[PDB]
Symmetry: C2
Subunit: 67 residues, 2 copies
């Protein structure tokens, strides 16, 4: 599955405890091509995710070097 993200925003940084676990929930809105990651109801990440219909290997040709 080739995927394209857009307008990703990171709202808060989740910290991994030395003991226990953190539950992250992921909800997709397929119609609007949007997603949302949450932890205990507090938004952590937001943006747009959808499938790349027609890949172009040209996009991965290396850019003109700065130097």
């Amino acid at each position: 599955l080739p995927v394209v993200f857009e307008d990703v925003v990171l709202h808060q940084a989740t910290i991994l405890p030395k003991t226990g676990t953190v539950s992250l929930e992921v909800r997709l809105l397929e119609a609007s091509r949007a997603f949302e990651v949450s932890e205990n109801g507090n938004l952590v990440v937001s943006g747009k995710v959808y499938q790349w219909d027609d890949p172009d290997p040209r996009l991965f040709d290396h850019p003109e070097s700065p130097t």
Copy 2:
């Protein structure tokens, strides 16, 4: 439930069929306080909806008419 809708956008009109039924699906993202209404996989209504924490009657006092 006193509620608040915000930044609502209607993207297309659903035509109610004379015979049959049309099924609308509504999904909520509580953390983002956003909602989407899709019709067979096509976005219809998008915006934000959330509970009104502190209702206040003053907001409904009738504005003095300019005329």
